[PDB]
Amino acid sequence: MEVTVPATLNVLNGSDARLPCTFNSCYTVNHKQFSLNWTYQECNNCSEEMFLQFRMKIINLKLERFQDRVEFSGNPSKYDVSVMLRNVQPEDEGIYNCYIMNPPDRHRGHGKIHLQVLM
Amino acid sequence: GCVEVDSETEAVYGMTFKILCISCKRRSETNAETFTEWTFRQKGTEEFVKILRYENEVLQLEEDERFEGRVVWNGSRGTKDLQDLSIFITNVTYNHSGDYECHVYRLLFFENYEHNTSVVKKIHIEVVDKANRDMASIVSEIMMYVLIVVLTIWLVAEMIYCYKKIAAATETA
Amino acid sequence: GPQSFVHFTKQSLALIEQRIAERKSKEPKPSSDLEAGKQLPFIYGDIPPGMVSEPLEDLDPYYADKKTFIVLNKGKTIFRFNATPALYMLSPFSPLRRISIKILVHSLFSMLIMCTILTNCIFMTMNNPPDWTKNVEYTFTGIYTFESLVKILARGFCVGEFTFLRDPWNWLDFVVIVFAYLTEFVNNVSALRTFRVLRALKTISVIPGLKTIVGALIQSVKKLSDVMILTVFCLSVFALIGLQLFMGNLKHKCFRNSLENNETLESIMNTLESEEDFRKYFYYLEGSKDALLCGFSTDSGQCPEGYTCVKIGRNPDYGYTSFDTFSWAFLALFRLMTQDYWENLYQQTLRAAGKTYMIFFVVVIFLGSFYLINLILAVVAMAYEEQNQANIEEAKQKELEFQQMLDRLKKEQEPYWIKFKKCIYFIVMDPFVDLAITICIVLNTLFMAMEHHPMTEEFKNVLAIGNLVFTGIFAAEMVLKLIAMDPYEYFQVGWNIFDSLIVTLSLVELFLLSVLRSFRLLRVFKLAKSWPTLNMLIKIIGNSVGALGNLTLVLAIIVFIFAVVGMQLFGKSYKECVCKINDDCTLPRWHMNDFFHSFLIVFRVLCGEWIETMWDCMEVAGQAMCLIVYMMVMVIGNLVVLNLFLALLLSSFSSDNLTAIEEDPDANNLQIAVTRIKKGINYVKQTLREFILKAFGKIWWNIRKTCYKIVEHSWFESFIVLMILLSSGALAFEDIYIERKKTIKIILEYADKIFTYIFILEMLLKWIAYGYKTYFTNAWCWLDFLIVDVSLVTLVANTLGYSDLGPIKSLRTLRALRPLRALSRFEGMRVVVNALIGAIPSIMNVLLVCLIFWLIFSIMGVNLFAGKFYECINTTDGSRFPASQVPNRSECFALMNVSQNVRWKNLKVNFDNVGLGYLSLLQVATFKGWTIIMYAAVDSVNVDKQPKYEYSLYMYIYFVVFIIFGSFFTLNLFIGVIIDNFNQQKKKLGGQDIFMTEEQKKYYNAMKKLGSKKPQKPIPRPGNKIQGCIFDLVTNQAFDISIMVLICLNMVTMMVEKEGQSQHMTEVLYWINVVFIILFTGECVLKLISLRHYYFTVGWNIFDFVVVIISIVGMFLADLIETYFVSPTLFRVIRLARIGRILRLVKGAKGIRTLLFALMMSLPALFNIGLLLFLVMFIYAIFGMSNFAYVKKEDGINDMFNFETFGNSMICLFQITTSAGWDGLLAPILNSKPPDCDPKKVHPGSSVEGDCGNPSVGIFYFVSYIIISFLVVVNMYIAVILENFSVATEESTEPLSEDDFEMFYEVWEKFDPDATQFIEFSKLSDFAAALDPPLLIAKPNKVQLIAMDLPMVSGDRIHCLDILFAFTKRVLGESGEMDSLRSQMEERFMSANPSKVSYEPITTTLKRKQEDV
Ligand SMILES: CC(C)CCC[C@@H](C)[C@H]1CC[C@H]2[C@@H]3CC=C4C[C@@H](OC(=O)CCC(=O)O)CC[C@]4(C)[C@H]3CC[C@]12C
Ligand SMILES: *[C@@H]1O[C@H](CO)[C@@H](O[C@@H]2O[C@H](CO)[C@@H](O)[C@H](O)[C@H]2NC(C)=O)[C@H](O)[C@H]1NC(C)=O
Ligand SMILES: *[C@@H]1O[C@H](CO)[C@@H](O)[C@H](O)[C@H]1NC(C)=O
Ligand SMILES: *[C@@H]1O[C@H](CO)[C@@H](O)[C@H](O)[C@H]1NC(C)=O
Ligand code: NA
């Protein structure tokens, strides 16, 4: 599955960071079966923390590390699964992953963004 | 396949008779489980009484004098899916004259759905001493004989006149 | 001549430039011979060794003045360039250009290019190219920049005349150059790679003769213009009919009646997606992706109890099948015209709308599917014939010219080895060894026709030893010949070489495939030395790759390019979007993911199957692309295929055969042996006979003459016709409902006793009138006789209790042959039989040549597939088990031991033996039931081993190879023989139409005049002031043009209507249609008031007035029918009157009016051939009904389409007259052994038992019907082509008057002043020069007057009438009216002049001249 994300995303401290993620799946997005997981790892060999998931609807896990700054910013039926991180902080630097399953499409998609926080 | 033929309405004393009840499922590929119940009302008696029930490859006959020892199952065999619910009378009496109701109780098995249906056929039976023959056969046999004789006569008449005419022509020549 | 060859030096440039300046101060076609790209005339002979490949001066004079330079290669190829500097830089003299030119016209230039292009073609076939391939792509992109630069440097670029951008195929090279680099620098991948298939087209520009071919195919398309217009028009008129009759019918479904949880169709229809959930609320047949169709009339499909029929939800086939909008309706109609999977559709429309609507399909098949296609074929053939003719005429002319030039040139000139090898040349014997080898080939092929699947190891031993013994004897023939005739002498003959190759391939097999085993099968073609129609197959094939080889190559290129384009465009969509077209998410059978599967769809499209693959394309890749691509392949492709077929036909038909040599000039050794046999068998028998001899009543005649009167009377004839028809009609009541109609069943048994009585009497009368001879020598009487004999056998057996002995019971099914009594009585059927039986002898031979060729394919099928189509299948879901589990028969059986629903089953139609292979080949050739057979073949593994998906994928070649040879070249041979035959049928009878009867010919002749009339009188104007103005407006051409544009607008308004359309849209279209009618009605009245009565003197004018009243009543009555009456069916059928308004566009079109007059001329022949076919169906219906009505309902056979009733039999028979679905109808008739059928099955309402079918009877039925069907439609095509071909090449008109004869007499009175009625032959040459045109003969008359052969009376005198008649004949020609007018002239002269004695002719003007000489 083709997943389009910026490999590196550079955002100023305090600004809003939209993490763009779209995916080219031919099959129509069935909200009763579509699956999305967004996770966060400090490093490629570090632990992933799921912070948002679409099962039947948008589930925001409200991880303490993000406070209430995470928002969904996509539209699954339009093949957009982007998220928004409001008022970015230096600790938000790291790796963010968009996992995508669009049954009955066989292949799972994976986008990886390296978010860097500028002064 | 399945063809619904109405029953014969006349039976002769002392012989055997097959009352015909045929109910066909509206589509043949379908699967069902059918049972039957039969009710009989004798001439000049006003209530239809139950005389038999056939279900799951077994006839259950009711305690009636007029049909005891005298009814067998003449319909579908080997299935729960019956389309022929015919019965057979082995020795006809004058107490078998009357009207009959054939009740068909079909349970169709579809995908996520069972439909219980019912159909009723009515049969009138007159019990007679001898087999009164049919109007059709009679009039059709006579009609064939009259038409054939008429055609023969017409062919002869034309043969006669033309022969005479050709003989006259030969004499003129 | 040749001495003209000189190097363009600046001096000749300056002498060309000076001349141009002179022309300017003062201020032609060139040698087609010399014209570039041509051979230098032999008139110039050889080139000086230094002048070749050098800028030389212009030969052709036309250009000698303009500025140019020509260059010739070492192959005398003329190349013309521009003397003008290339991009204002390079000159012819410049060494830089000199080199570009040197390369441009050499052969190592173009071979290199051919290679490059072909190698790129191989690389375009890969779907996932690896990485070592981008280097190659650079490398090819550069072999292309090079050539383009060489052309730019040498010819210049664009400014001049013969410059690079002037060539139209160099534009293609230019786009190839730009798409490559431009897109690369910019960097859809698919789009980029499809832009690359354009490189595949440089082949046309490089292989020689591919452009002439491509240009000729563009000439076949331009002539196809008015047929293409008629085609679109008819397709649209029928589409608008199906839209009106069927709008929304395909939507109907069977909706459950009880719904829980307060639910509605509405709510349920918003909350459902899967087919698993639609299968809970709607009714679906097991294994069907669509909900089952139903309807609301008693002749439509029915729903099961528990469901009710309703219109809701998608249309069938992913929604692509419908008459809902005009665009979908047009698609169903194109589909019906091409007859692609049309039976599926015919079946869905009958089930959903009623069985009555079949009339609709009949008309469509007859008009669109048959007639439009016929027109196309005819036009294309006429194009090709005019083309061949131009070729020859010009070719003969040119050859004559060259021979004349040659003539002018001529005028200007004016030991032990020896012994035994000669013994072996003697041992080989023409009558014997050669006849031996023939017998052995036949024996060998028969021996190989005995391989079959249930074969014992003994029967296998005997087969392989035989296959070796024959091999050895063919090889001894080989070696012996090779040592007798010298080896160089031996490989001189091509038959010898072929035999040698076969022998060596057989020896290699002996040292060692499965397919190699069957090459020894081509030794059969060695029977073509003597058998002359096998030699016609060999020449068709030979021409495909010889004299039509370039066209064949162009076909190959096109298929290839379509295959690769298709792949690049949809290939990755087929993988990504697969779950949509398959539930197991794996690729379907047909797809474009790789090159091979992609070639296969294109080939299937050429075969005529496109829709089912296209449905899928549309689902994975979108509608627009799929429809553009599949349509291009259907058009271009079928056109290249047709032009090939026609070129083959024409050529091999009359071009190749010219009786140049004698019939077997070197007496066929076969015939030599035949002569030897005539010597022997005759001589020896005679000697044996010699040895045996040495050892040893007016009144009876009067009854005869009476019988004649009657049997020959028109009332006897009508009593009987009536009687045949009634007795034929009585059989149609003997269906499975007969026991529900007691009275009609008794009426008919008695009607049958009578029918037999009458026919016996008729037979007796014929005997008395004709006598046993004139009766038993007549074939039609022989047929009556037999019918009455079987009838009498049934009657007498029956009245003797023999009514159920089973053989007598099968004799009763023979009554289906009673309607054959109908053939003798109707001339139309009698003349078509006469035509067909005349063809039988020529057809019999094609069939032998065709049965034999199909036998090689059959034996190979067996060697390839016998025993390998058995599979382990799970019966409840009907699916093959894998091979991981249960890979063998043993394991299939072990699985049976545990699980009940397990079966090891073989396909019914297969290649287990040659007989079965024949049936399989028929299904493949006809494209009906072939997919399954191919799948079993490509899944094949080995005997008793479970099939695996596409294990033998490349077995499809077997099938493509058979289609080409067994179908394509076989049909070609069949058509070529039918045409020389039908042509001969017309010739012996004087050229009269073979299919039309006497009275019908008189009508035909009267209609050929209708379409021929000359201009009429101008309609008198109304003298009144206002009426006259009305007249001048109506009679103007602008009026007509406006009426025609309004009809087009009316057609548009009808095409806008669609299912679901709002009520406001309904209302606006009603009112627009009301203004159209009021306009078309006022048109009526203006014309009707200005033209007065003369309105009704025009036929179109009367169609126009009948269209206004069908329109006005239709609107009013449909309004009345939708309100104070109710009948949706009636409303829709009466609104069809609006089609009347649109048909009036043919008065406008002049080329579809002429094509339509061609259809009207052909209607009598068609009515006559159609009567034959209808009666043939009626018999096959009665038979179906007596044999096939109880058979199990699977595949094609179902609750609506079966043989249970007469109406139901005719439906099936009409479907298979076109060959559609026949294999689905046969399959259930092949169930004879349980577990396929139940022998004891009970049928409620009947005493008949079992649901089995008899394969012997079934196979016979279907094959017989399809063959007769095919035969009678060949005749429909003959008839139509005959009409089209004359209609399109015929014109007539007459030009003379009473004043011409007055001129003749006014000139006659000047030469015969006494009125003697005679002139001297002396004066005739001055008389004939004193008449005005048309009768004028200009001086010198005397040669023409001697060629008229005028009679001469006593004294070298000629009579007035002889001169008049000879001059009349000169103007009018030799028509049939000339001899009737002549008879009248003779009669009217004999009544005016009783004196016969003065008119006796002694000599004629030609005879006289001969005597003088
Ligand atoms: C046994 C009784 C109850 C019935 C006898 C019927 C025969 C008298 C009929 C049936 C077959 C008829 C024969 C059918 C064939 C011929 C051959 C026919 O001669 C030819 O056709 C010659 C043709 C030729 O020379 O090219 C002469 C009539 C004849 C004998 C017919 C004579 C009358 C026959 C013998
Ligand atoms: C058909 O396929 C089976 C595969 O199961 C072949 O079978 C043997 O299977 C049994 C039970 O699984 C084992 O005991 C044997 O060892 C298997 N054979 C081998 C060679 O390992 C079976 O032989 C096949 N049929 C034929 C005719 O070869
Ligand atoms: C008929 O009914 C009568 C009573 O009305 C009874 O006596 C008689 O036995 C019955 N006959 C038969 C054959 O059942
Ligand atoms: C109608 O539907 C409602 C659902 O809101 C349900 O509560 C009610 O019982 C239904 N009525 C009947 C008669 O089924
Ligand atoms: Na198809």
Swiss-Prot record, chain A:
Supply the source organism for this entry: Homo sapiens (Human)
Q: What is this protein called?
A: Sodium channel regulatory subunit beta-2
For this UniProt record, the keywords arranged alphabetically read as follows: Atrial fibrillation, Brugada syndrome, Cell membrane, Cell projection, Disease variant, Disulfide bond, Glycoprotein, Immunoglobulin domain, Ion transport, Membrane, Phosphoprotein, Signal, Sodium, Sodium transport, Transmembrane, Transmembrane helix, Transport
Q: Which domain of life is it from?
A: Eukaryota
Extracellular compartment segments: 1-119
The entry's cellular-component GO terms read:
axon initial segment; node of Ranvier; plasma membrane; synapse; T-tubule; voltage-gated sodium channel complex
One Gene Ontology term of the biological-process aspect is: cardiac muscle contraction
Q: Where is this site: Binds SCN2A?
A: Y27, R106
Q: Which cysteines are joined by disulfide bonds?
A: C21-C98, C43-C46
Give the similarity note: Belongs to the sodium channel auxiliary subunit SCN2B (TC 8.A.17) family.
Q: What is its main location?
A: membrane
Locations listed in the record: Cell membrane; Cell projection, Axon
Instruction: Supply one GO molecular-function term.
Output: voltage-gated potassium channel activity involved in ventricular cardiac muscle cell action potential repolarization
The way this protein sits in the membrane is described as:
Single-pass type I membrane protein
Function recorded in the entry: Regulatory subunit of multiple voltage-gated sodium (Nav) channels directly mediating the depolarization of excitable membranes. Navs, also called VGSCs (voltage-gated sodium channels) or VDSCs (voltage-dependent sodium channels), operate by switching between closed and open conformations depending on the voltage difference across the membrane. In the open conformation they allow Na(+) ions to selectively pass through the pore, along their electrochemical gradient.
Curated annotation (Swiss-Prot), chain B:
List residues traversing the bilayer: 139-160
Q: What is the effect of changing R66H?
A: In ATFB13; the mutant results in highly reduced sodium currents and altered channel gating when coexpressed with SCN5A in a heterologous expression system
GO BP field:
axon guidance; cardiac conduction; cardiac muscle cell action potential involved in contraction; cardiac muscle contraction; cell adhesion; corticospinal neuron axon guidance; locomotion; membrane depolarization
- GO CC terms: extracellular region; intercalated disc; node of Ranvier; perikaryon; plasma membrane; T-tubule; voltage-gated sodium channel complex
Which residues are modified by glycosylation? Answer: N74, N91, N95, N116
Q: What does this protein do?
A: Regulatory subunit of multiple voltage-gated sodium (Nav) channels directly mediating the depolarization of excitable membranes. Navs, also called VGSCs (voltage-gated sodium channels) or VDSCs (voltage-dependent sodium channels), operate by switching between closed and open conformations depending on the voltage difference across the membrane. In the open conformation they allow Na(+) ions to selectively pass through the pore, along their electrochemical gradient.
Recorded protein name is Sodium channel regulatory subunit beta-1
Organism, as annotated: Homo sapiens (Human)
Which gene underlies this protein?
Answer: SCN1B
Which part of the entire protein is covered? 20 to 192 of 218
Curated annotation (Swiss-Prot), chain C:
* Top-rank lineage group of the source organism: Eukaryota
Please state what the protein is called.
Answer: Sodium channel protein type 9 subunit alpha
Q: What disease is this chain connected with?
A: Primary erythermalgia: Autosomal dominant disease characterized by recurrent episodes of severe pain associated with redness and warmth in the feet or hands.
**What is any Pfam family matched here?**
Na_trans_cytopl
Q: What is the effect of changing M1160K?
A: In PEXPD; reduction in fast inactivation leading to persistent sodium current
Which consequence is recorded for altering E1122Q? Answer: Decrease of the inhibition of fast inactivation produced by the scorpion alpha-toxin CvIV4 on this channel
Q: Where is this site: Is directly targeted by the spider protoxin-II?
A: E509
Similarity remark: Belongs to the sodium channel (TC 1.A.1.10) family. Nav1.7/SCN9A subfamily.
Name the source organism: Homo sapiens
Q: What is the effect of changing S1012A?
A: Abolishes stimulation by agents that stimulate PKC activity
**Where are this protein's IV repeats?**
1019-1317
